[PDB]
């Protein structure tokens, strides 16, 4: 059973600037101290990206609708792991196969399966004042599933779940693509010391997984977590976090491979005449 959460102020969408981000390894080929020009789905340098907030201060809870054209770059600026997972699909109401990725308090679940997805799916972590402990208590994402084709659960572990105070100190960059029936996820993590921005510099994302799913994805959504300790739809705290979403398109990039074999710099081929030269 899921209930739509109320008490969410409406604010116009905010878009910010991405500076040389959303670059990943095109393939698994090892190259040393060379220049490689490759044409593939990529994110433009110095582009516009959708910025969504989560701050208590309204509570700025953002889990809106987002299309999935050809691939999505998802950056998460966090300090206490508020954002939990992602959902991919077309109809989102059990009449079409959908992919679900959730990193709950103990395991990681990747499940391709038919969900009756709620309009407002979320996680909920309860904070105890009698004893200092943060634990996941609520998971309102899907109702039921009859057919369920792909299952993957990682080994059990433990996560912090505590809400720290201060500026953001973690960045998690992800790239999701769906080509030839294969769902490719590239990932990287970075330590940062900013309060609100999309950090500059160069960061090449290493591939994480290539799942043989073979479904059609034209629509994707995010899943965050809230803190509880009001009513079932008013008594919730968001927790500071932010995430930026960008859309990839077929572009040509010139990558530089150093002696270590990692991508250290890249240039867009259609940004400015200098980079084209």
């Amino acid at each position: 059973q899921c209930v739509n959460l109320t008490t969410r102020t409406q604010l116009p969408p905010a878009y910010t600037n991405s500076f040389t981000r959303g670059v990943y390894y095109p393939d698994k080929v090892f190259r040393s101290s060379v220049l490689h020009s490759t044409q593939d789905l990529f994110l433009p340098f110095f582009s516009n990206v959708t910025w969504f907030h989560a701050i208590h201060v309204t509570k700025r809870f953002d889990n809106p609708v987002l299309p999935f054209n050809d691939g999505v770059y998802f950056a998460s600026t966090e300090k206490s792991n508020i954002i939990r997972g992602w959902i991919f699909g077309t109809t989102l109401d059990s009449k079409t196969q959908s992919l679900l990725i959730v990193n709950n308090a103990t395991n990681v679940v990747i499940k391709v399966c038919e969900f009756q997805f709620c309009n407002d799916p979320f996680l909920g972590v309860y904070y105890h004042k009698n004893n200092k402990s943060w634990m996941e208590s609520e998971f309102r994402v899907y109702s039921s599933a009859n057919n369920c084709t792909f299952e993957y659960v990682s080994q059990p572990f433990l996560m912090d779940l505590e809400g720290k105070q201060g500026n953001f100190k973690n960045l998690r960059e992800f790239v999701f693509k769906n080509i030839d029936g294969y769902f490719k996820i590239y990932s990287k993590h970075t330590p940062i010391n900013l309060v609100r921005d999309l950090p500059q510099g160069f960061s090449a994302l290493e591939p994480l997984v290539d799942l043989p799913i073979g479904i059609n994805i034209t629509r994707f959504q995010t899943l965050l977590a809230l803190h509880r300790s009001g009513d079932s739809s008013s008594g919730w705290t968001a927790g500071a976090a932010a995430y930026y979403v960008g859309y990839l398109q077929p572009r040509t990039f010139l990558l530089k491979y150093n002696e270590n074999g990692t991508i250290t710099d890249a240039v867009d081929c259609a940004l400015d005449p200098l980079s084209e030269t």
């Binding site: 080929v29 090892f30 043989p212």
Partner: protein, 295 residues
């Protein structure tokens, strides 16, 4: 002399042919085989359901091996339609459907596509274009009990079943004054039991039957992809993860990233490869070759 196409040769040096070292001891290297679907769960299962409620299982995302099943020789019948008992190892399909049940001796013939019969029409109808295999083995010591094993049931009365159709709703069948859902005249029971006895002969003894069907439309489950040993310091024809080449493999000081398999030199030529079995990096260099001049 043949090169110049003349019987006299002037003083000098002439390029005739090119000496090349033929590759020897060709090797194929594929990743470790450590993911097999539970075929034993389908076969070695302690109990099987009725033929009208046959157990259905999905098979995908493994490294399957059908050679052990064929070479087991414990199955009385192994009939494959659309495929052969051999050559099945190196074929990939998107998914596999396994249907498990128990039948009698004469019922073996009826479990086949294009074959008529009461059971083939009311219990389990195979499609005309069925592709897959059927494996039947005797279970006189497991599915037969003294006094009669009546646990296995088959539909007897029915008005036709589509291929791969499951019908759990088997309400009382009316043969024509209607009895209104009550046992009586003009309406008999739809189900009937087998009653396997130890005394029953080969024509009535129980038989566990599993039907495997392969459906393809990316492939998820493939064959064992057997590999060979690794040899160095020789001109070798190598096959690393589908990448086929010729040359000598040597120890390399290059350090590959964990997600990178093979390396390419300038101008997109393979220079080093990492073998998936032990994650070892080997430099590939073409074996000795070059022109041969006659002085």
């Amino acid at each position: 002399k043949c090169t110049l196409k003349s019987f006299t040769v002037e003083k000098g040096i002439y390029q005739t042919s090119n000496f090349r070292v033929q590759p020897t001891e060709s090797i194929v290297r594929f990743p470790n085989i450590t993911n097999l679907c539970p075929f034993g769960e389908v076969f070695n299962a302690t109990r099987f359901a009725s033929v009208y409620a046959w157990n259905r299982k999905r098979i995908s995302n493994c490294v399957a091996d059908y050679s052990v099943l064929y070479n087991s020789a414990s199955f009385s019948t192994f009939k494959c339609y659309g495929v052969s008992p051999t050559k099945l190892n190196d074929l990939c399909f998107t998914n596999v459907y396994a249907d498990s049940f128990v039948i009698r001796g004469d019922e073996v013939r009826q479990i086949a596509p294009g074959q008529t019969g009461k059971i083939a029409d009311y219990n389990y109808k195979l499609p005309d274009d069925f592709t897959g295999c059927v494996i039947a083995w005797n279970s006189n010591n497991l599915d037969s009990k003294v006094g009669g094993n009546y646990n296995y049931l088959y539909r007897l009365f029915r008005k036709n079943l589509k291929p791969f159709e499951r019908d759990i709703s088997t309400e009382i069948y009316q043969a024509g004054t209607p009895c209104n859902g009550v046992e009586g005249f003009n309406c008999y029971f739809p189900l009937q039991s087998y009653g396997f006895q130890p005394t029953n002969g080969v024509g009535y003894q129980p038989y566990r039957v599993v039907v495997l069907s392969f459906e393809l439309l990316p492939a998820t489950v493939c064959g064992p992809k057997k590999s060979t040993n690794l040899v160095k310091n020789k001109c070798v024809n190598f096959n690393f993860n589908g990448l086929t080449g010729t040359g000598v493999l040597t120890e390399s000081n290059k350090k590959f990233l964990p997600f990178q398999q093979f390396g390419r030199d300038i101008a997109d030529t393979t220079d080093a490869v990492r073998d998936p079995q032990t994650l070892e990096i080997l430099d590939i260099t073409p074996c000795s070759f070059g022109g041969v001049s006659v002085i």
